[PDB]
Amino acid sequence: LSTASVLAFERKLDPSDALMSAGAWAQRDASQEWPAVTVREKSVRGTISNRLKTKDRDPAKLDASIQSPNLQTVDVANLPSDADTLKVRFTLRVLGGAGTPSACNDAAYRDKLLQTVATYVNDQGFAELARRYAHNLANARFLWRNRVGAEAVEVRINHIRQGEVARAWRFDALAIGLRDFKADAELDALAELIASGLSGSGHVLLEVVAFARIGDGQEVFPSQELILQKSKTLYSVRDAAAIHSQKIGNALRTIDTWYPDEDGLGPIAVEPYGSVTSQGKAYRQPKQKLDFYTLLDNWVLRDEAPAVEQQHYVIANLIRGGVFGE
Amino acid sequence: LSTASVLAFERKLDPSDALMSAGAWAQRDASQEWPAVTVREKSVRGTISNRLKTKDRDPAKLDASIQSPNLQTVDVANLPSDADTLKVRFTLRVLGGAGTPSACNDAAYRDKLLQTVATYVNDQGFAELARRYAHNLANARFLWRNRVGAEAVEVRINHIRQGEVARAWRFDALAIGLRDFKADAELDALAELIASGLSGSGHVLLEVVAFARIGDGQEVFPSQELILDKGDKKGQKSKTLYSVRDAAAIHSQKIGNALRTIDTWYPDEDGLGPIAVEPYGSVTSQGKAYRQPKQKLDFYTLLDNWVLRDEAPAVEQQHYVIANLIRGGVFGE
Amino acid sequence: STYIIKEVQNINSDREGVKVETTSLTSAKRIASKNQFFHGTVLRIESESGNWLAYKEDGKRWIE
Amino acid sequence: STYIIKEVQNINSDREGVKVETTSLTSAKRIASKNQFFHGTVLRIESESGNWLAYKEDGKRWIE
Amino acid sequence: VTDPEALLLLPRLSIQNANAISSPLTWGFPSPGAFTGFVHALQRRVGISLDIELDGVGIVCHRFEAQISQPAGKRTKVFNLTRNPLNRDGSTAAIVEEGRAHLEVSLLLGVHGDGLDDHPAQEIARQVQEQAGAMRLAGGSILPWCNERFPAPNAELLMLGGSDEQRRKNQRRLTRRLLPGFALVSREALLQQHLETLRTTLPEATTLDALLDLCRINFEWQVRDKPGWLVPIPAGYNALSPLYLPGEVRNARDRETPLRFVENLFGLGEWLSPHRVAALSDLLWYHHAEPDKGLYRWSTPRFV
Amino acid sequence: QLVTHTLKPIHPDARGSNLHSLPQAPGQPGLAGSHELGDRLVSDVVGAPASHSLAKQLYFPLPGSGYHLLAPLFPTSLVHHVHALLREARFGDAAKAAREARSRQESWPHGFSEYPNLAIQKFGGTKPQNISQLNNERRGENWLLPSLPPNWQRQNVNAPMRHSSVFEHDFGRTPEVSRLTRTLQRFLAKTVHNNLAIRQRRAQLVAQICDEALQYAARLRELEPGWSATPGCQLHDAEQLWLDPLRAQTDETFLQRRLRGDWPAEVGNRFANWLNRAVSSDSQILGSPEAAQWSQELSKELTMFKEILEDERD
């Protein structure tokens, strides 16, 4: 019973674009019609800050470059003239059927996978993954630079059912530990709702709206769009700044903390081979048996159930979805 | 009496492109001017997570690839800032004369085929195929990813007669079983209308409009347009979505293929639901082709036997053969 | 002859590549295939400039 | 070919120019460079009409 | 070139996934033969029921939208192909060349049958439109006119009766609704004129078409001027082999008529606004065949 | 084998009778075909006439006779000939210098022709060798010619009710008319020697202006549901009468009543003045022979233009 050369799993928990706006912390109770932050252009005089080879460089060569600097145009987004609070609004949907494979070459493999998934669900539910996801949704971990140096960050996660707000929730990213997961009644309720949606007990829609105190006329750091002079290109939708769907889903999936290093990095995004771009190192290297592909191959062909931690990581990967096999 | 080296049957039930728009479910009934969804461009920065080939004894080599990400451009379609309901509108026509062959080398073969078709119709009508198609049209089975994760899907089929007046209907895809076919007054009426159109009533036009609740700012998934031109330089997009009149849509054949997913008599019939009516029971997603030629259930073999030897196969095989003839194609050699 | 060997998921993508500095392009193709780190990647050989020299899909033969 | 050679501090300006009546643009360019009356001026070649044919900055190469 | 008694004008006929190649060396608007044969196939079925005669077919293209993408490597565009189903062997399908596009066109059907007077004109028009809707023109489905606005009916008008004043008023009324689109006509006068003009240099026909259909630049610099839009078209198919009895040609789809191997023949057509044309009858395309020579052309002779 | 037609590039499964060559030239002088060359025939080696389903057989009607099916083939010699003729033009050091001269403005004796909007077609797909007479470089390198009508490129139509386009609506400048006006205004500098040919190109260029103008109004009326009151109605009153919407259900019956008894006659004057101001002329040349023909052409064009709108209201 070999594997299928073609294997794909549709991603789950796919959110939508995140719109941004500005306003006054006082008006936080009423936040509608606020004008969006429009990107603008400003000239910046380029400078030589790169590390040049001392062997190639010389005293005259340096004075030559700084003599005629290379001008470069960039794009920046700043809050309105009078605005001290930034607002971000993005929705989230729960599709479900994570273990259900989208396409498989062999039927036996698909049946074995569905059986293993049903067995795992029966033994223990997704409540653990839902609880971990609840913390990430509650806190502002999704923000990369806007969160750093913020006075007050307030997240509001509502529940949209049949077009109405079934139940609202309000949390505090600052109060909630960034590197520590603490239990709360609201977090448990949200985790239960997510587990139900994933299990297929009903449609689940959550509208997350965050309000972060940055400062008057501050400069927000939106997602820079790919370049085709103009060097920095910001991604604007309908003349409004936003964050990429994948850019949000990457932070929202920071649930991988069982790496073999136990360093101070903290939450790591679920990615095959535990690759990290910023750190430049990939934990869970293929040499070990903890790799996702090896764990799934063993638990499928040899029916070897790995540690609960590895099983959770494998289920998280299947939920995120991707392309496997060959 | 040998077969004809050249055999072709014009396809029937050929739909057109499906326009899409976004709006509020409350105004969907009273507002049909919903603006179309315009395609947009986005950039993604991902790592290479594919399976490794070289030995895993080189840890540094792996970390190196991680330092270099993968950059590409794609196309996405998202609803307007304030829109939670997606609308899709597409028409369908019924030509008729499925059994009537378009071209045949020998006249005797054509006459025998017409006689067998008339005999089958007299014995039992196409009401079975019409009923199966009615379920597909009523439900959202045509949608591949838009249906998954939907709050409420409402389909409305309008029979456009000589005038604007029509018998507009309203169904529920969620309430209707996806893997089970149940009888209903509206389904029977639709099947009768389809059978009449196929029999040659004179004119049949059905405008199907669907409204699916997805969410504010959600992303629709249109049919990617194949290009096949890799190009000699960079500065191109890796994913191109099919768009007409600056509006996203789904291919006509891509819609007509899903709508005709009534082939449930395949030999395996083990967990799989409806499948597209195609020769050799090929499946792209599953990558397997049921009804292999080695068996006697093959469409070509069954038709050859029922024509030359006049052997009437099981009612299921006859239904499948009539469905394939309705779909149309090129057979023989 | 300096040739930049790059790897990407789809034939259409931008990524840095290693400089082989090989004598001939065919030699470059063989070296790239030997150094492939992946099964689903699309090998793309490019010169020092922005002109694309050649590409090879995972399930397809070399193309120029 | 009548070409109007003009000199200005910045590419954006409205100053009159001499009519060379040269055969090709390369001739007008070589003439402007050989007879350049200023170091920091920006050469601007234009046809008899108001259409700008080409420009050249003090520290930059010819551009069209 | 029979004088048509009446003319039926199809207001708007949409087509999807039509044939946009029309020729081995050219691509674009479909060959006129596809439209001419269509009216012929309709007359063979409805002509007997309604006792009407259709010999002239006018073509007016209102909207043409192809499916092409321009690559970044070169300035030559490419078409958007489709995905073929998996082969019976289970291996991946083979990619094949194909074309698709959205074509909104209006056809003029010349009614030469005297029996039209014996039946209502509106009923004849509706009966013809009903078959035209179910029919497939150019190789694709014909999407009827259905939208928020009211539908567009087919109008048949007799051009035989009435004074020249009424005839001109009718032609103006028709051009008023046919202005958004451009008509199609065959122009062989300029083609033969240029052929004889450049015959001294070399007797090459394809070279003349290639030179005419391109951006010509003259040394001064200057660009050559044309009075109107001129483009090559498939005037017809020339006979490449002698006629063979139905038995001689193997795998023939019919034993009633003999098979003949033919080749491709190009030409030069011109796009002129309907207001430019004076007589509408000159727009209708008439198929002419020669039994001796295998030359078969749909060019409208009355246009010259 | 050597043949002038093959089914390998046309279809992979296409098999049938391939003619060795054309013994006679059936192509008439009135048209252009492969039979008109009779030379430069290139036939490569592939790898009871019979046909196949993919032969694309099509019936042809006959006057008062039966039907004849035609099974066309894929011309290879003509295709290769046209391909080489266009390759030597687009490429080569000879044509290369020609295009470079255009940028330098040098009046080089040779003239280079361009082929915009070209299309590429691949033969054999993954296995180009399967195609007959298709070499390694010749496979998929065969480019076609664009036959799309000039109206293939369609853009949006915008007619707002504000003053931004209310004042400039009368002009309606379009990229199609902009390229024609530059060619038309270039024929006014010709001397008496060039006045012989100017009597045809300039005469034909006037009709194209009215044609491109009427198309804009037609597309506007066929895309905009209507236009309400707008600012700048002093000179724009005549333009608003070009595109007439239907009377609204909630409106009065005095809108159509006033427009019914009024004929659009100022549109011609506004168009004539617009063209006069758009195209430059010389004052001293008013008493020359060119001015007479220019006024005659403008009058002939204005007459047909006014006549076209006269039947619109009536």
Author numbering:
A (entry chain G): 25 to 252, 260 to 357
B (entry chain H): 25 to 357
C (entry chain J), D (entry chain I): 3 to 66
E (entry chain B): 3 to 222, 239 to 322
F (entry chain A): 38 to 84, 168 to 434
Excerpt from the publication:
The Cas7f subunits are each shaped like a “right-hand” and two molecules of AcrIF9 (AcrIF9.1 and AcrIF9.2) bind the “thumbs” of the Cas7.4f and Cas7.6f subunits, respectively. The two AcrIF9 binding sites are similar, and the specific residues interacting with each of the AcrIF9 molecules superimpose with an r.m.s.d. of 1.4 Å (see “Methods”). The contacts include a hydrogen bonding network between AcrIF9 residues Q11 to S15, and N94 and Q96 in Cas7f. In addition, Q11 of AcrIF9 also hydrogen bonds with a nucleobase from the crRNA (C13 to AcrIF9.1 and U25 to AcrIF9.2 respectively). A second cluster of hydrogen bonding interactions is found between AcrIF9 R17 and residues S89 and S92 in the Cas7f thumb. Furthermore, the aromatic sidechains of AcrIF9 residues F39, F40, and H41 form an “aromatic clamp” around residues L76 to T78 of Cas7f and additional hydrogen bonding occurs between AcrIF9 residues Q38 to H41 and Cas7f residues R75 to T78. AcrIF9.1, but not AcrIF9.2, also interacts with Cas8f through hydrogen bonding of the Cas8f R224 carbonyl with AcrIF9.1 the L27 backbone nitrogen. Based on the similarity of the binding sites for AcrIF1 and AcrIF9, we predicted that AcrIF9 would sterically block target binding.
Here we set out to determine the mechanism of immune system suppression by the previously identified, but mechanistically uncharacterized, anti-CRISPR protein IF9 (AcrIF9) that specifically inhibits the type I-F immune system in Pseudomonas aeruginosa. We show that AcrIF9 inhibits the crRNA-guided surveillance complex (Csy) by sterically blocking the hybridization of target DNA to the crRNA guide. In order to determine the mechanism of immune suppression by AcrIF9, we co-expressed and purified the Csy with AcrIF9 and determined the structure using cryo-electron microscopy (cryo-EM) at a nominal resolution of ~3.9Å. Overall, the complex maintains the previously described seahorse-shape, comprising a hexameric Cas7f “backbone” that is capped on one end by the Cas6f “head”, while the other end is capped by a heterodimeric Cas8f and Cas5f “tail”. AcrIF9 is a 7.9 kDa protein made up of a five stranded, anti-parallel beta sheet cradling an alpha helix, a fold distinct from AcrIF1.
